[PDB]
4-KE-4
Amino acid sequence: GEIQKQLKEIQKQLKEIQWQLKEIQKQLKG
Amino acid sequence: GEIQKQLKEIQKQLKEIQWQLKEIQKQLKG
Amino acid sequence: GEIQKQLKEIQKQLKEIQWQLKEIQKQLKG
Amino acid sequence: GEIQKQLKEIQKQLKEIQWQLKEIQKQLKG
């Protein structure tokens, strides 16, 4: 259903943000 | 359709956050 | 109801995250 | 899955992101 599809997309966006934060944390270490 | 509308606002807000995290990654380039 | 209310809490958390990103970019400039 | 649980799990993930960003803010000042 459409609401559940939107929630799944939001979960994917959060995983992408978590990836971006890990990249930033790596940049701050180096 | 108020739940769908609110979820779409959240999706747009997460895109704003992704864009700004990408800008932070630029600032942190070596 | 509870769905709108918890989505509103998510939006508030996302707003506060955006303010953290604003501050982080300010720190990197300074 | 059940929507209210999904929304609470998102809220927990956003608290973790707030925490991670606060750690980054501290690094840039100290």
